Amino acid sequence: MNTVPFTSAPIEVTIGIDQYSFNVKENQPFHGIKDIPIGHVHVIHFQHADNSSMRYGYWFDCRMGNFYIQYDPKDGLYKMMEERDGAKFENIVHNFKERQMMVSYPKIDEDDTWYNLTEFVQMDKIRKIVRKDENQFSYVDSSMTTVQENELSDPAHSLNYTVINFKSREAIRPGHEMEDFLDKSYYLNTVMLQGIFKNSSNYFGELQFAFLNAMFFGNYGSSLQWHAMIELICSSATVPKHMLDKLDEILYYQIKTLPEQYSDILLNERVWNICLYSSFQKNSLHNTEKIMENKYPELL
Amino acid sequence: GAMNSSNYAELFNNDIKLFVDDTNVYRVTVHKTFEGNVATKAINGCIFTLNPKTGHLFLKIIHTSVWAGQKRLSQLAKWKTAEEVSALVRSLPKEEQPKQIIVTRKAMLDPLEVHMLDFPNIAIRPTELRLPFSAAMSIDKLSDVVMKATEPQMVLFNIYDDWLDRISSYTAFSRLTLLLRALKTNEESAKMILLSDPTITIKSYHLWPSFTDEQWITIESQMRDLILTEYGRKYNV
Numbered sequence: 001m002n003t004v005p006f007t008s009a010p011i012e013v014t015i016g017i018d019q020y021s022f023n024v025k026e027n028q029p030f031h032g033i034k035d036i037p038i039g040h041v042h043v044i045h046f047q048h049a050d051n052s053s054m055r056y057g058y059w060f061d062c063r064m065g066n067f068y069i070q071y072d073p074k075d076g077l078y079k080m081m082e083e084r085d086g087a088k089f090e091n092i093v094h095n096f097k098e099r100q101m102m103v104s105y106p107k108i109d110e111d112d113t114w115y116n117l118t119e120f121v122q123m124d125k126i127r128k129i130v131r132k133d134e135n136q137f138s139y140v141d142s143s144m145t146t147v148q149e150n151e152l153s154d155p156a157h158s159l160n161y162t163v164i165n166f167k168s169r170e171a172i173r174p175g176h177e178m179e180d181f182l183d184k185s186y187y188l189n190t191v192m193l194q195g196i197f198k199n200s201s202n203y204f205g206e207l208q209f210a211f212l213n214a215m216f217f218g219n220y221g222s223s224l225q226w227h228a229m230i231e232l233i234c235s236s237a238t239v240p241k242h243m244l245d246k247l248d249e250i251l252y253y254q255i256k257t258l259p260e261q262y263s264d265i266l267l268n269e270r271v272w273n274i275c276l277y278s279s280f281q282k283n284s285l286h287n288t289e290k291i292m293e294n295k296y297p298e299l300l
Numbered sequence: 301g302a303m304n305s306s307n308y309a310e311l312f313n314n315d316i317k318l319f320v321d322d323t324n325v326y327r328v329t330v331h332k333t334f335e336g337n338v339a340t341k342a343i344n345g346c347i348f349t350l351n352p353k354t355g356h357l358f359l360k361i362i363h364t365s366v367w368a369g370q371k372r373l374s375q376l377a378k379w380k381t382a383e384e385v386s387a388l389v390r391s392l393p394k395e396e397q398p399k400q401i402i403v404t405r406k407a408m409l410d411p412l413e414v415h416m417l418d419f420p421n422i423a424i425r426p427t428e429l430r431l432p433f434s435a436a437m438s439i440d441k442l443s444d445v446v447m448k449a450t451e452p453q454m455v456l457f458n459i460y461d462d463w464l465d466r467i468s469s470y471t472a473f474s475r476l477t478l479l480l481r482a483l484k485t486n487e488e489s490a491k492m493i494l495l496s497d498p499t500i501t502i503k504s505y506h507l508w509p510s511f512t513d514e515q516w517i518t519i520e521s522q523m524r525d526l527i528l529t530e531y532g533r534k535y536n537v
Contacts, residue, residue: 167410167413167414167417168417169417169418172414172417177379177382177383177411177414177415178376178379178411178414181410181411181414182375
């Protein structure tokens with residue numbers, strides 16, 4: 001069980017840790033988050049009380065170093081930092097724990113929600129989509145644009161998601177125009193799975209990370225990426241049985257976790273209707289179709 | 301984006317463009333089977349590819365053999381149309397290639413766009429105009445070559461005959477759309493108007509009769525009357 005200490009909380013802020021969140025008042029004696037489950041990635045995220053615009057946060061894995069948060073009154077945000085001095089850090093953490101100024105990661109023993117949302121997500125893959133290689137953690141916010149969004153403008157602060165474009169020479173073999181456009185199996189299995197991702201795990205990882213960036217930061221390009229990756233599988237007549245079964249489970253937990261009130265901005269009507277009702281795999285997503293129909297019948 | 305009444309003069313500027321109409325590509329007669337079920341028999345079709353500025357018609361004849369042992373023919377027709385248009389563009393020298401292709405039916409946009417991925421500088425555009433190009437098979441000489449074809453064949457026409465010698469493209473295109481709109485609303489009446497006077501013939505190398513400027517005004521007026529009459533009937537107004 002690992003800890004992300006906070007130096008202080010000088011400004012009023014809603015703090016998210018994974019799917020949980022806590023209001024902290026200006027100058028409240030808050031010194032961080034303890035009992036963070038080892039073995040998963042995590043995101044610690046912020047929304048300032050005085051500016052509900054710019055949700056921002058940090059993807060990290062406690063196995064990769066000792067991480068703390070410190071407010072920068074110049075840049076006006078909570079910044080993640082690495083403490084390289086192991087003894088200074090154990091000493092800071094033990095003091096704050098003894099004085100009980102840390103909230104406990106509030107995991108219910110029965111509850112596999114976070115594992116289910118991050119099953120294929122791996123810090124090394126996040127660090128390739130979010131390039132800032134001097135840090136072991138990854139900053140994302142509401143406004144960051146994707147590499148594809150920028151083609152259609154600062155490359156330093158982009159989300160480098162795998163570009164998926166159904167009307168591209170990459171997606172369409174010369175002389176198999178109609179076949180490759182109506183059945184995307186070749187784009188899925190040869191170009192994307194075998195060629196770029198290498199395996200279903202890396203594909204699912206990027207799909208699950210795109211979803212979480214959409215839900216936690218309202219990142220619009222992350223949303224497009226999540227829908228594009230779902231649509232590529234659903235529009236393929238030929239998908240391994242294990243990928244279809246795992247996709248159903250992935251999507252189920254994402255739909256289950258979405259704030260009920262954000263379904264209108266986070267879910268693309270056309271994609272979901274196509275995927276559950278028109279596509280080749282319309283009959284392959286039983287759990288996803290059941291939770292979508294019972295929780296968001298309006299959208300459909 | 302889309303081509304409408306507001307950007308109509310763009311058809312007659314000096315950027316090569318083509319209209320593509322796919323409405324006569326897949327043609328069937330519906331009939332009863334001996335067992336009293338219904339079946340279709342395909343007949344020869346055609347892609348109507350027209351440069352509206354020059355009158356050059358690239359009539360690609362679709363022989364019924366292209367459908368043999370294929371499924372979802374009305375879907376395949378849109379993709380076969382896009383394949384044939386792409387191939388015509390590749391066959392043309394660079395300086396004759398269109399800068400735009402305007403499809404008369406929105407369902408042609410994705411099939412043509414995917415077939416034209418090698419030509420990212422050719423804009424594929426829909427239209428809000430209701431163009432009567434479906435009536436092209438009411439022009440006797442175009443109908444004759446489609447129905448007689450025994451194999452796939454491209455036949456080149458000038459749908460304006462020699463009119464550009466005397467009128468602008470704009471006026472030539474208005475005369476063409478009026479003739480086709482008339483043939484579409486009442487083929488027989490329209491065809492009666494065009495041949496009523498046996499002294500005005502169609503040259504061997506033309507599609508329409510050899511009307512003087514004065515005789516075209518009379519014809520154009522008769523065609524407009526036909527369209528409004530038929531319209532009053534359609535709608536009891």
